[PDB]
Amino acid sequence: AKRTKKVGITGKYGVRYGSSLRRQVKKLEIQQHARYDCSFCGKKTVKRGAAGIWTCSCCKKTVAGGAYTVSTAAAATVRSTIRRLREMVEA
Amino acid sequence: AREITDIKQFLELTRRADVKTATVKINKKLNKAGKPFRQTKFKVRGSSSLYTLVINDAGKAKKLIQSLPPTLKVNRL
Amino acid sequence: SKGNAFKHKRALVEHIIQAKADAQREKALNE
Amino acid sequence: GRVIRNQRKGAGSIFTSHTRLRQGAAKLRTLDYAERHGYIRGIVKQIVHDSGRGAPLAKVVFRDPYKYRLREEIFIANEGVHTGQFIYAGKKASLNVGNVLPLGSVPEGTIVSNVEEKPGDRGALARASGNYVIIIGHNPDENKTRVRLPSGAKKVISSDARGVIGVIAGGGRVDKPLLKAGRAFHKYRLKRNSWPKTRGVAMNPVDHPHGGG
Amino acid sequence: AQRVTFRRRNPYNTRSNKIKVVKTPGGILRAQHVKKLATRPKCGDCGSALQGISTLRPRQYATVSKTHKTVSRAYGGSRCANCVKERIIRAFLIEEQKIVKKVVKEQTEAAK
RNA sequence: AUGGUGAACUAUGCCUGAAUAGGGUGAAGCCAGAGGAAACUCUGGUGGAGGCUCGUAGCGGUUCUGACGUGCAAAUCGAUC
RNA sequence: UUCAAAUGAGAACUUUGAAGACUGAAGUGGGGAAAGGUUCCACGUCAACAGCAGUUGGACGUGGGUUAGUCGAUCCUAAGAGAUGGGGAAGCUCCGUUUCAAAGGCCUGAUUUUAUGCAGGCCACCAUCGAAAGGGAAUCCGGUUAAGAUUCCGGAACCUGGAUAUGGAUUCUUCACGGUAACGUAACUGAAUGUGGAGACGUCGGCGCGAGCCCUGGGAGGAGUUAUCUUUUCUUCUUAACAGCUUAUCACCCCGGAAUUGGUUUAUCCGGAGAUGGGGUCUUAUGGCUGGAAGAGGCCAGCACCUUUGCUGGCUCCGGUGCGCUUGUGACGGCCCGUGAAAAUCCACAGGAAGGAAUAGUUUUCAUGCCAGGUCGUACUGAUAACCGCAGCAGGUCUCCAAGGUGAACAGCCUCUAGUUGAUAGAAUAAUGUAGAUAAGGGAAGUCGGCAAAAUAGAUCCGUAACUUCGGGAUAAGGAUUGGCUCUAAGGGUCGGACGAUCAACUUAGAACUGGUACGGACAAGGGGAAUCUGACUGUCUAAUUAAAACAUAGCAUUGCGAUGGUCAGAAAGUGAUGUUGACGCAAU
RNA sequence: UUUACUUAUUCAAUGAAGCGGAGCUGGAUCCACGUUCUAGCAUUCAAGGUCCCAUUCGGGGCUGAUCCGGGUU
Ligand SMILES: [Mg+2]
Ligand SMILES: [Mg+2]
Ligand SMILES: [Mg+2]
Ligand SMILES: [Mg+2]
Ligand SMILES: [Mg+2]
Ligand SMILES: [Mg+2]
Ligand SMILES: [Mg+2]
Ligand SMILES: [Mg+2]
Ligand SMILES: [Mg+2]
Ligand SMILES: [Mg+2]
Ligand SMILES: [Mg+2]
Ligand SMILES: [Mg+2]
Ligand SMILES: [Mg+2]
Ligand SMILES: [Mg+2]
Ligand SMILES: [Mg+2]
Ligand SMILES: [Mg+2]
Ligand SMILES: [Mg+2]
Ligand SMILES: [Mg+2]
Ligand SMILES: [Mg+2]
Ligand SMILES: [Mg+2]
Ligand SMILES: [Mg+2]
Ligand SMILES: [Mg+2]
Ligand SMILES: [Mg+2]
Ligand SMILES: [Mg+2]
Ligand SMILES: [Mg+2]
Ligand SMILES: [Mg+2]
Ligand SMILES: [Zn+2]
Ligand SMILES: [Zn+2]
Numbered sequence A: 001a002k003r004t005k006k007v008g009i010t011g012k013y014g015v016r017y018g019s020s021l022r023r024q025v026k027k028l029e030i031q032q033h034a035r036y037d038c039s040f041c042g043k044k045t046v047k048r049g050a051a052g053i054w055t056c057s058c059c060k061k062t063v064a065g066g067a068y069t070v071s072t073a074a075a076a077t078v079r080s081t082i083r084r085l086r087e088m089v090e091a
Numbered sequence B: 001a002r003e004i005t006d007i008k009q010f011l012e013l014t015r016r017a018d019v020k021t022a023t024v025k026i027n028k029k030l031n032k033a034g035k036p037f038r039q040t041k042f043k044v045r046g047s048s049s050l051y052t053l054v055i056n057d058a059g060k061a062k063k064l065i066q067s068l069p070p071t072l073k074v075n076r077l
Numbered sequence C: 001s002k003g004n005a006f007k008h009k010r011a012l013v014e015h016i017i018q019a020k021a022d023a024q025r026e027k028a029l030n031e
Numbered sequence D: 001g002r003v004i005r006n007q008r009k010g011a012g013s014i015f016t017s018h019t020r021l022r023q024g025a026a027k028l029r030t031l032d033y034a035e036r037h038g039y040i041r042g043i044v045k046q047i048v049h050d051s052g053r054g055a056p057l058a059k060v061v062f063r064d065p066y067k068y069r070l071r072e073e074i075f076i077a078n079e080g081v082h083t084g085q086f087i088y089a090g091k092k093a094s095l096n097v098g099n100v101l102p103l104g105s106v107p108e109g110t111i112v113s114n115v116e117e118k119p120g121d122r123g124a125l126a127r128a129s130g131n132y133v134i135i136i137g138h139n140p141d142e143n144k145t146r147v148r149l150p151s152g153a154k155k156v157i158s159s160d161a162r163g164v165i166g167v168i169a170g171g172g173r174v175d176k177p178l179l180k181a182g183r184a185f186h187k188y189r190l191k192r193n194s195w196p197k198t199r200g201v202a203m204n205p206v207d208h209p210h211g212g213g
Numbered sequence E: 001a002q003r004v005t006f007r008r009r010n011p012y013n014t015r016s017n018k019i020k021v022v023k024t025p026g027g028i029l030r031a032q033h034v035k036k037l038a039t040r041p042k043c044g045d046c047g048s049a050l051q052g053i054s055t056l057r058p059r060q061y062a063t064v065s066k067t068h069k070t071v072s073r074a075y076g077g078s079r080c081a082n083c084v085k086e087r088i089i090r091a092f093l094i095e096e097q098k099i100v101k102k103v104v105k106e107q108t109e110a111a112k
Numbered sequence F: 001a002u003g004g005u006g007a008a009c010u011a012u013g014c015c016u017g018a019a020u021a022g023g024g025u026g027a028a029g030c031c032a033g034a035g036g037a038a039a040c041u042c043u044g045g046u047g048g049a050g051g052c053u054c055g056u057a058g059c060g061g062u063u064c065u066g067a068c069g070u071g072c073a074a075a076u077c078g079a080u081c
Numbered sequence G: 001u002u003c004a005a006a007u008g009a010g011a012a013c014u015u016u017g018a019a020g021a022c023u024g025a026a027g028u029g030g031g032g033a034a035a036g037g038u039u040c041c042a043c044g045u046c047a048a049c050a051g052c053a054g055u056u057g058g059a060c061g062u063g064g065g066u067u068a069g070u071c072g073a074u075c076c077u078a079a080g081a082g083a084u085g086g087g088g089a090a091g092c093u094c095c096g097u098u099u100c101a102a103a104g105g106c107c108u109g110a111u112u113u114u115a116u117g118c119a120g121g122c123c124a125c126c127a128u129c130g131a132a133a134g135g136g137a138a139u140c141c142g143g144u145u146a147a148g149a150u151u152c153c154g155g156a157a158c159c160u161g162g163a164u165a166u167g168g169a170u171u172c173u174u175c176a177c178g179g180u181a182a183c184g185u186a187a188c189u190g191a192a193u194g195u196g197g198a199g200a201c202g203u204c205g206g207c208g209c210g211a212g213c214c215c216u217g218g219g220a221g222g223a224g225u226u227a228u229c230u231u232u233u234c235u236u237c238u239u240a241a242c243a244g245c246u247u248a249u250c251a252c253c254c255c256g257g258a259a260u261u262g263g264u265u266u267a268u269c270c271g272g273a274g275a276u277g278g279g280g281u282c283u284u285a286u287g288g289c290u291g292g293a294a295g296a297g298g299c300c301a302g303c304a305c306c307u308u309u310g311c312u313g314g315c316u317c318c319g320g321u322g323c324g325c326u327u328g329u330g331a332c333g334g335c336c337c338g339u340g341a342a343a344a345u346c347c348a349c350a351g352g353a354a355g356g357a358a359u360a361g362u363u364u365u366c367a368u369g370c371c372a373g374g375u376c377g378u379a380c381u382g383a384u385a386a387c388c389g390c391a392g393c394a395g396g397u398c399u400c401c402a403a404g405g406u407g408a409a410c411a412g413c414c415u416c417u418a419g420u421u422g423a424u425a426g427a428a429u430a431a432u433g434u435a436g437a438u439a440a441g442g443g444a445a446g447u448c449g450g451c452a453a454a455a456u457a458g459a460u461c462c463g464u465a466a467c468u469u470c471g472g473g474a475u476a477a478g479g480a481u482u483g484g485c486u487c488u489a490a491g492g493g494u495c496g497g498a499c500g501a502u503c504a505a506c507u508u509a510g511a512a513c514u515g516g517u518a519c520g521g522a523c524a525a526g527g528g529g530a531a532u533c534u535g536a537c538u539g540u541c542u543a544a545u546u547a548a549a550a551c552a553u554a555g556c557a558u559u560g561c562g563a564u565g566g567u568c569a570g571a572a573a574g575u576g577a578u579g580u581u582g583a584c585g586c587a588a589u
Numbered sequence H: 001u002u003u004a005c006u007u008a009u010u011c012a013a014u015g016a017a018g019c020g021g022a023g024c025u026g027g028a029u030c031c032a033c034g035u036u037c038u039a040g041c042a043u044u045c046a047a048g049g050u051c052c053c054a055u056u057c058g059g060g061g062c063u064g065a066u067c068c069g070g071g072u073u
Helices: A009-015 A020-031 A073-090 B007-015 B058-067 C007-031 D005-012 D034-037 D181-189 E057-062 E081-111
Strands: A044-048 A055-057 A062-064 B002-004 B023-028 B036-045 B050-055 B073-076 D039-048 D057-063 D070-076 D085-091 D100-102 D110-115 D133-140 D142-149 D155-158 D164-167 E016-023 E029-034
Touching: A009 A020, A020 A044, A062 D039, A073 D110, B002 B007, B007 B036, B007 B050, B036 B058, B050 B058, D034 D085, D085 D142
Parallel strands: B002 B050, B023 B073, D085 D100
Antiparallel strands: A044 A055, A055 A062, B023 B036, B036 B050, D039 D057, D039 D085, D057 D070, D100 D164, D110 D133, D110 D164, D133 D142, D142 D155, E016 E029
16 A cells, blocks of 8 residues: 655655655665665665664674765776776786 | 571670670561561661561560670660 | 454454364365 | 955854864874885774764774784775774785775776875875775886876875775765755754855845945 | 652752652652663673673772672673684684694795 | 953854643555556555644744833733734 | 731731632742842831831841751863963063973892992873863761751761771682583682773654552541431551662573474564574662661540649551553664764773792681761742842743643643732722623625624534645535433453453443533634735844845855865964865855 | 085974895895784793803893994984
8 A cells, every 4th residue: 555656755845845856865765774785694684874884783794885875886896996906916 | 787587696796896785676466467476676786787686486585585695785675 | 463454352263263164174175 | 344254264263163073083094114114904993973074984993013002093984894894004005995005006097095195194185975086197217196186186196195995985975955954054063154154145235245236 | 749859959850860759757758869870881892781790880890899790701791702702713713724824834935 | 543341131153951731644664455477556554754734831023093101111011923 | 808806006908716719730839040148037126118007027126047978069071261391572462282392200229249429121291270950989767946957866877098807718739619501609819011891972753661649449547517318528547778688671591403484563573693492691770578667757545734844555457440640761663964072980801020828828809897087058039029120120030849620631710738818998880991791684885904803613424626846735615413311332351271250441333311592501712715926945133113025045056276275364473264174075156 | 507415494294113225134126935814812121042150039141133324204
């Protein structure tokens, strides 16, 4: 039983702030309140403490990450680039 | 205030060096909500704490009163 | 019960009785 | 004419930074013998939020090389750094995210952050969330390194200047609308007294040159 | 129906000015000032509450015996049993690996 | 013009404290049922979000051919808000 | 507001008694903070003051009264304030707060002896002020005064510091044993140095538990009503700090190895990184029993008297209930581009410099015993008369406790405890006023203008349009009902093997009967709708004539700056804000 | 005029700790082959080796840990 057709989590804002701004906020709020897999213990138990800080309820591991997601595309690209450079340096 | 239950410990407390005074108190109580009976509390006044020994036997209480040391100052009732 | 299928204790008891009867019937028919 | 707010802010007074809840200044280690010649290993003990700063910070504990004790440093957390991770700082440190290396020891295209402008000033460039510095190239004869800054500028700095491998965590913060004067209020309460802002046109000519009409 | 007053000159509801209502042997209600509750000591490695350690205000720990403040184990008190076990395992395994690596490095130096 | 005194009122920042009945509405997450290859849709619950709402304490001060005008008062009183 | 008596020359205003009322626990009650400074209390007493009076008084005259190791200050640090070393300034003085300083403590020594001269080492960062609401060692009960009270008196405790003895414990295996473990205990050496914890922390929501209060039964006392009735209405039946034993959500340990996935909260999380299950360990919020402690306190009865003097007997017991109120607390959940103090102080761990026993040692973190705790504040009001407003001024001024009914309710109305009965009075009832009401028929014809009044209003049910950012509009609009009485049905807990025994609460629905001119019967409480202009919204300002279309706001856009810098400050300076900052930033719009 | 230097002056940091030069020092002009699976630990003039003492509870010297500089970086 869906209670709202489109506003979803942004139903708490009522008719305020504008529809496009409410959509923009909705996307990032869903991202920031989602639950993510832990790369250490393999469980889906990682939640945001504060902006950029992501803690796993099990195994008590805290990782730095993005403001509203655990990993950003820029960070993933940087990781791949650093891996390639390290492999080139070793080889 | 402390409660003691060992009779030998009570006698040692009465013979302790700093102990000068004791009090004997008589209460009228009911055992298992039955007939009235007599309860005796012996209270030894120490320097730091007051020690209480409770005896529900009148004959044993009378025997203990007789066995109290003579230099100890006893306040009855 | 968490999903609000039973109005009260008597309804739950009647449903339990019916479910046990249906399980016994199915087991006897498959035997 | 009356003194405007732009001129008033220089005297300090009510325009100073609100620093009660800060964790401490975020700096690299002091450039010492160990970092100049080899490397030194510390451990990430916790990752914490700093009031008034978008990016999280990381507490890194090293051993004192000259005395039996522990030294705690406050680094700016790069993305991917976790609690319990080992961090290596020095000229001989490996090329891994979170390590502190001189700019001359990394290849072209390396992405770094908290980069020293001069060797030993303990971090000056690319400190805000999501920002980084790109290693464009090297000039070994002058012992220099060409880098690209977040603003797009190209700079030449010493190859002995240090930088932390990776990108500052907490990126994408400014993509969320605040929606509310209240959220802006709570944002600047932890930073300084610069909000709300009154337009100069709405003022009198005595208050601001833009006033009148 | 009996109403009470603060027994000290602080009239505000601060963290150090908390009261409860108690009936006295005189048959009347009276305020009674309650101290702030103590916090259990925490582990130095994981931050969890320490089992078997008394929970007191920090000055009160000077009045009790050493039994109430320790347990009979290495790091008893400051660290918990699971963390102590983990660091024992880590110490032994890393020392064995150091011996192995030294032997391997000596053999590689000899062969090289 | 020269030299001094004021942030006990009030303007603003900071530090450390304190205060704020009872209702209405019913967001996300979750459960059950009816559909569907899935995505997803519908029904009934649960949950208790919001610089939401009605309305006390409180804060403020819209209106009245209002009271008063050497007034209780060099800015007050009543109702309404 | 009234009656009587007393006092007095004199009484509407003083005192006591008799009456009628009020504040109605968000008080006209009981305490405090700021402020005041004796206003507190007793005796005497009326010239002036209390806009009438006065025998009265916060007035006048004379005195009495404030007792602390445990309550505060004192100590700590917060935003901040501010010397020294230095550097500016003709100078009064300014910058800066650990620098730019030779800024001060400790250990060892027969230093291979040159003969009566101090040698070898170790560790390091800055005065002071800043909270009677932050942090913090430790005290309660009963009684006592004209006025003191967690301070005095009686009894019972606790903290800190110090010297020390005995008992206990440990040792010839020297610095304890037990438990697989979680860990337990009356103890069970410890210097440098390092490390960890506590101090130490936001807000909201529901749920669980405790305490006090609320409601209620039996019994033992006391009071009231009794024209008629009521085994009746009201009231007392209490238990502090501290101490011993015991007591728990959470968490953890051992066994064991899970799909037919199970456990499980109001709220959906957990489990091969070891679930369910069985057995254990711990924190002692909190509760129970006992000591304290019935000897106290409470409620009654009976003694002699001018006694300003003494004294005796009884009872103080046993239960129940809850979406109740207040408050404390636990495990949780929601929220942030907001993640929500420091320091004094205390403890513990790692380490083992060392010291210590055989006919004798050790251990003052176990028990007991001994001594001490200075200075300053402490009365009272805290407001329609003790503060401020030129006043005993309808104004202003921070906070704690908080009963019964009706009712959703700290609303309105009535009541118990407590506290007031103060504000110049008496006699008449013209006009005009101030405040509040009613009105035949018509219903805005009044007026610049429906200004003002009236109408509506609670709860339940039926039903609810355009438009829309799809969230709203909305309680849209428009309709029906509501009392009392007598019943019926549904919704549970605790124990036992289809059910039985026992106990208890308030919600909803339905059906007869009955009064009616009224049934949210007082109180309480939206009028609604069709449109235009205008500002997005929530928010803010002209204190004392303008609350708005003005300002702010989120969103959008432009410009400057990579620190040898941008925007600013200072007379200067080895000066300062942004800056505990670094383009996802700061600054100017 | 051009090109250098440091010593005045200027800027910054630190615990003024490792700077500059050289090693018949070693491995291959460059390096210390003393530190990189792991949230352990690293502190009592440093153990060991070697010369003495007057052996006795231990005490000294060189080394461990290369040398030189008239510049804290
Ligand atoms: Mg203007
Ligand atoms: Mg002020
Ligand atoms: Mg609102
Ligand atoms: Mg409202
Ligand atoms: Mg009234
Ligand atoms: Mg009344
Ligand atoms: Mg007069
Ligand atoms: Mg008086
Ligand atoms: Mg007087
Ligand atoms: Mg100064
Ligand atoms: Mg001070
Ligand atoms: Mg305090
Ligand atoms: Mg008094
Ligand atoms: Mg006393
Ligand atoms: Mg007093
Ligand atoms: Mg008082
Ligand atoms: Mg005054
Ligand atoms: Mg004055
Ligand atoms: Mg009419
Ligand atoms: Mg007309
Ligand atoms: Mg006309
Ligand atoms: Mg409408
Ligand atoms: Mg507006
Ligand atoms: Mg005005
Ligand atoms: Mg106005
Ligand atoms: Mg505007
Ligand atoms: Zn994990
Ligand atoms: Zn632990």
